[PDB]
PDB file of all heavy atoms in Angstrom:
ATOM      1  N   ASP Y 148      91.644  62.666 106.404  1.00 49.91           N
ATOM      2  CA  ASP Y 148      90.789  63.684 107.085  1.00 49.91           C
ATOM      3  C   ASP Y 148      89.644  63.958 106.156  1.00 49.91           C
ATOM      4  O   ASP Y 148      89.881  64.164 104.925  1.00 49.91           O
ATOM      5  CB  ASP Y 148      91.561  64.960 107.378  1.00 49.91           C
ATOM      6  CG  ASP Y 148      90.830  65.876 108.361  1.00 49.91           C
ATOM      7  OD1 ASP Y 148      89.762  66.399 108.050  1.00 49.91           O
ATOM      8  OD2 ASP Y 148      91.338  66.062 109.535  1.00 49.91           O
ATOM      9  N   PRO Y 149      88.407  63.977 106.637  1.00 50.78           N
ATOM     10  CA  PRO Y 149      87.252  64.217 105.825  1.00 50.78           C
ATOM     11  C   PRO Y 149      87.455  65.548 105.104  1.00 50.78           C
ATOM     12  O   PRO Y 149      87.201  65.662 103.931  1.00 50.78           O
ATOM     13  CB  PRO Y 149      86.112  64.312 106.779  1.00 50.78           C
ATOM     14  CG  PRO Y 149      86.483  63.399 107.900  1.00 50.78           C
ATOM     15  CD  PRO Y 149      87.979  63.634 108.037  1.00 50.78           C
ATOM     16  N   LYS Y 150      87.831  66.577 105.869  1.00 50.18           N
ATOM     17  CA  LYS Y 150      88.090  67.904 105.344  1.00 50.18           C
ATOM     18  C   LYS Y 150      88.872  67.989 104.046  1.00 50.18           C
ATOM     19  O   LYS Y 150      88.738  68.952 103.318  1.00 50.18           O
ATOM     20  CB  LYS Y 150      88.670  68.805 106.409  1.00 50.18           C
ATOM     21  CG  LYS Y 150      87.650  69.097 107.527  1.00 50.18           C
ATOM     22  CD  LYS Y 150      88.105  70.207 108.435  1.00 50.18           C
ATOM     23  CE  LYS Y 150      87.051  70.588 109.472  1.00 50.18           C
ATOM     24  NZ  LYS Y 150      85.843  71.213 108.861  1.00 50.18           N
ATOM     25  N   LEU Y 151      89.650  66.946 103.771  1.00 51.94           N
ATOM     26  CA  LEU Y 151      90.360  66.885 102.521  1.00 51.94           C
ATOM     27  C   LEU Y 151      89.401  66.914 101.347  1.00 51.94           C
ATOM     28  O   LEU Y 151      89.550  67.617 100.361  1.00 51.94           O
ATOM     29  CB  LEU Y 151      91.172  65.596 102.408  1.00 51.94           C
ATOM     30  CG  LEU Y 151      92.700  65.500 102.631  1.00 51.94           C
ATOM     31  CD1 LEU Y 151      93.165  64.097 102.370  1.00 51.94           C
ATOM     32  CD2 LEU Y 151      93.327  66.408 101.612  1.00 51.94           C
ATOM     33  N   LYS Y 152      88.394  66.052 101.474  1.00 54.90           N
ATOM     34  CA  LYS Y 152      87.388  65.909 100.418  1.00 54.90           C
ATOM     35  C   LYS Y 152      86.594  67.106 100.077  1.00 54.90           C
ATOM     36  O   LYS Y 152      86.304  67.271  98.884  1.00 54.90           O
ATOM     37  CB  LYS Y 152      86.445  64.771 100.832  1.00 54.90           C
ATOM     38  CG  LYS Y 152      87.086  63.417 100.931  1.00 54.90           C
ATOM     39  CD  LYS Y 152      86.119  62.264 101.285  1.00 54.90           C
ATOM     40  CE  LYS Y 152      86.719  60.881 100.993  1.00 54.90           C
ATOM     41  NZ  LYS Y 152      85.758  59.834 101.258  1.00 54.90           N
ATOM     42  N   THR Y 153      86.282  68.005 101.061  1.00 52.37           N
ATOM     43  CA  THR Y 153      85.474  69.134 100.821  1.00 52.37           C
ATOM     44  C   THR Y 153      86.074  70.525 100.981  1.00 52.37           C
ATOM     45  O   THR Y 153      85.462  71.483 100.511  1.00 52.37           O
ATOM     46  CB  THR Y 153      84.259  69.085 101.764  1.00 52.37           C
ATOM     47  OG1 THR Y 153      84.613  69.376 103.095  1.00 52.37           O
ATOM     48  CG2 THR Y 153      83.611  67.673 101.728  1.00 52.37           C
ATOM     49  N   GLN Y 154      87.258  70.600 101.608  1.00 52.86           N
ATOM     50  CA  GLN Y 154      87.817  71.922 101.830  1.00 52.86           C
ATOM     51  C   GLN Y 154      89.112  72.360 101.042  1.00 52.86           C
ATOM     52  O   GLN Y 154      89.217  73.488 100.619  1.00 52.86           O
ATOM     53  CB  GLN Y 154      88.097  72.140 103.340  1.00 52.86           C
ATOM     54  CG  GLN Y 154      86.831  72.407 104.104  1.00 52.86           C
ATOM     55  CD  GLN Y 154      87.125  72.921 105.518  1.00 52.86           C
ATOM     56  OE1 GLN Y 154      86.408  72.576 106.481  1.00 52.86           O
ATOM     57  NE2 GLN Y 154      88.173  73.748 105.645  1.00 52.86           N
ATOM     58  N   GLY Y 155      90.062  71.426 100.904  1.00 54.62           N
ATOM     59  CA  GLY Y 155      91.250  71.763 100.230  1.00 54.62           C
ATOM     60  C   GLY Y 155      92.475  71.042 100.766  1.00 54.62           C
ATOM     61  O   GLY Y 155      92.257  69.896 101.250  1.00 54.62           O
ATOM     62  N   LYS Y 156      93.632  71.601 100.672  1.00 56.73           N
ATOM     63  CA  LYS Y 156      94.822  70.901 101.230  1.00 56.73           C
ATOM     64  C   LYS Y 156      95.206  71.308 102.607  1.00 56.73           C
ATOM     65  O   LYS Y 156      95.942  70.570 103.279  1.00 56.73           O
ATOM     66  CB  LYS Y 156      95.994  71.139 100.225  1.00 56.73           C
ATOM     67  CG  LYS Y 156      95.785  70.547  98.830  1.00 56.73           C
ATOM     68  CD  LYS Y 156      96.523  69.273  98.565  1.00 56.73           C
ATOM     69  CE  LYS Y 156      95.714  68.019  98.888  1.00 56.73           C
ATOM     70  NZ  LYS Y 156      96.396  66.760  98.463  1.00 56.73           N
ATOM     71  N   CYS Y 157      94.752  72.463 103.080  1.00 55.00           N
ATOM     72  CA  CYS Y 157      95.124  72.978 104.395  1.00 55.00           C
ATOM     73  C   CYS Y 157      94.250  74.005 104.913  1.00 55.00           C
ATOM     74  O   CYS Y 157      93.441  74.685 104.256  1.00 55.00           O
ATOM     75  CB  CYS Y 157      96.510  73.602 104.194  1.00 55.00           C
ATOM     76  SG  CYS Y 157      96.388  75.181 103.335  1.00 55.00           S
ATOM     77  N   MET Y 158      94.419  74.275 106.234  1.00 58.09           N
ATOM     78  CA  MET Y 158      93.684  75.382 106.841  1.00 58.09           C
ATOM     79  C   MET Y 158      94.758  76.492 106.949  1.00 58.09           C
ATOM     80  O   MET Y 158      95.831  76.235 107.490  1.00 58.09           O
ATOM     81  CB  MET Y 158      93.179  75.035 108.240  1.00 58.09           C
ATOM     82  CG  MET Y 158      92.010  74.127 108.194  1.00 58.09           C
ATOM     83  SD  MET Y 158      91.348  73.732 109.818  1.00 58.09           S
ATOM     84  CE  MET Y 158      92.393  72.338 110.268  1.00 58.09           C
ATOM     85  N   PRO Y 159      94.572  77.625 106.290  1.00 59.67           N
ATOM     86  CA  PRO Y 159      95.534  78.735 106.360  1.00 59.67           C
ATOM     87  C   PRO Y 159      95.793  79.158 107.793  1.00 59.67           C
ATOM     88  O   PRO Y 159      94.859  79.120 108.588  1.00 59.67           O
ATOM     89  CB  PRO Y 159      94.834  79.815 105.453  1.00 59.67           C
ATOM     90  CG  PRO Y 159      93.441  79.424 105.477  1.00 59.67           C
ATOM     91  CD  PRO Y 159      93.481  77.945 105.349  1.00 59.67           C
ATOM     92  N   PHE Y 160      96.996  79.593 108.030  1.00 55.77           N
ATOM     93  CA  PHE Y 160      97.401  79.990 109.400  1.00 55.77           C
ATOM     94  C   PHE Y 160      98.645  80.912 109.253  1.00 55.77           C
ATOM     95  O   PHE Y 160      99.671  80.474 108.661  1.00 55.77           O
ATOM     96  CB  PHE Y 160      97.795  78.759 110.169  1.00 55.77           C
ATOM     97  CG  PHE Y 160      98.180  78.962 111.580  1.00 55.77           C
ATOM     98  CD1 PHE Y 160      97.275  78.820 112.647  1.00 55.77           C
ATOM     99  CD2 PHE Y 160      99.500  79.315 111.870  1.00 55.77           C
ATOM    100  CE1 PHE Y 160      97.665  79.007 113.941  1.00 55.77           C
ATOM    101  CE2 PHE Y 160      99.920  79.484 113.187  1.00 55.77           C
ATOM    102  CZ  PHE Y 160      98.952  79.348 114.234  1.00 55.77           C
ATOM    103  N   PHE Y 161      98.556  82.081 109.801  1.00 53.51           N
ATOM    104  CA  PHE Y 161      99.708  83.089 109.717  1.00 53.51           C
ATOM    105  C   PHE Y 161     100.365  83.177 111.063  1.00 53.51           C
ATOM    106  O   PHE Y 161      99.686  83.262 112.059  1.00 53.51           O
ATOM    107  CB  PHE Y 161      99.181  84.453 109.355  1.00 53.51           C
ATOM    108  CG  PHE Y 161      98.416  84.444 108.009  1.00 53.51           C
ATOM    109  CD1 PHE Y 161      97.018  84.322 107.957  1.00 53.51           C
ATOM    110  CD2 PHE Y 161      99.143  84.453 106.834  1.00 53.51           C
ATOM    111  CE1 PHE Y 161      96.435  84.333 106.701  1.00 53.51           C
ATOM    112  CE2 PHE Y 161      98.524  84.380 105.620  1.00 53.51           C
ATOM    113  CZ  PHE Y 161      97.168  84.356 105.544  1.00 53.51           C
ATOM    114  N   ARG Y 162     101.690  83.245 111.038  1.00 52.38           N
ATOM    115  CA  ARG Y 162     102.438  83.424 112.294  1.00 52.38           C
ATOM    116  C   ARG Y 162     102.065  84.658 113.040  1.00 52.38           C
ATOM    117  O   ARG Y 162     101.720  85.666 112.438  1.00 52.38           O
ATOM    118  CB  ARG Y 162     103.918  83.334 112.018  1.00 52.38           C
ATOM    119  CG  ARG Y 162     104.367  81.985 111.397  1.00 52.38           C
ATOM    120  CD  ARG Y 162     105.885  81.845 111.495  1.00 52.38           C
ATOM    121  NE  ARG Y 162     106.282  81.675 112.915  1.00 52.38           N
ATOM    122  CZ  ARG Y 162     107.579  81.575 113.275  1.00 52.38           C
ATOM    123  NH1 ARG Y 162     108.529  81.566 112.386  1.00 52.38           N
ATOM    124  NH2 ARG Y 162     107.853  81.424 114.562  1.00 52.38           N
ATOM    125  N   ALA Y 163     102.150  84.595 114.351  1.00 50.42           N
ATOM    126  CA  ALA Y 163     101.802  85.748 115.246  1.00 50.42           C
ATOM    127  C   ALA Y 163     102.816  86.862 115.240  1.00 50.42           C
ATOM    128  O   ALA Y 163     103.978  86.646 114.922  1.00 50.42           O
ATOM    129  CB  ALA Y 163     101.614  85.245 116.713  1.00 50.42           C
ATOM    130  N   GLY Y 164     102.341  88.047 115.560  1.00 48.75           N
ATOM    131  CA  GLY Y 164     103.194  89.225 115.619  1.00 48.75           C
ATOM    132  C   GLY Y 164     104.394  89.068 116.529  1.00 48.75           C
ATOM    133  O   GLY Y 164     104.334  88.223 117.440  1.00 48.75           O
ATOM    134  N   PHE Y 165     105.444  89.847 116.314  1.00 50.46           N
ATOM    135  CA  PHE Y 165     106.658  89.739 117.087  1.00 50.46           C
ATOM    136  C   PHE Y 165     107.386  91.090 117.327  1.00 50.46           C
ATOM    137  O   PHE Y 165     107.458  91.927 116.381  1.00 50.46           O
ATOM    138  CB  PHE Y 165     107.613  88.725 116.465  1.00 50.46           C
ATOM    139  CG  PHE Y 165     108.038  89.044 115.047  1.00 50.46           C
ATOM    140  CD1 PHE Y 165     109.289  89.527 114.784  1.00 50.46           C
ATOM    141  CD2 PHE Y 165     107.167  88.869 113.954  1.00 50.46           C
ATOM    142  CE1 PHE Y 165     109.693  89.757 113.474  1.00 50.46           C
ATOM    143  CE2 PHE Y 165     107.568  89.144 112.657  1.00 50.46           C
ATOM    144  CZ  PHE Y 165     108.833  89.672 112.458  1.00 50.46           C
ATOM    145  N   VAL Y 166     107.900  91.335 118.546  1.00 52.89           N
ATOM    146  CA  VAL Y 166     108.521  92.518 118.902  1.00 52.89           C
ATOM    147  C   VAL Y 166     109.722  93.036 118.119  1.00 52.89           C
ATOM    148  O   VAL Y 166     110.130  92.427 117.133  1.00 52.89           O
ATOM    149  CB  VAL Y 166     108.850  92.685 120.411  1.00 52.89           C
ATOM    150  CG1 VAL Y 166     107.739  93.514 121.098  1.00 52.89           C
ATOM    151  CG2 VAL Y 166     108.984  91.319 121.051  1.00 52.89           C
TER     152      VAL Y 166
END
Side-chain angles (χ1 to χ4, degrees):
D148 194 293
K150 289 191 177 294
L151 252 184
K152 297 183 164 183
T153 74
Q154 286 194 216
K156 298 256 93 172
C157 72
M158 288 181 274
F160 181 98
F161 302 98
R162 299 197 66 184
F165 59 105
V166 264

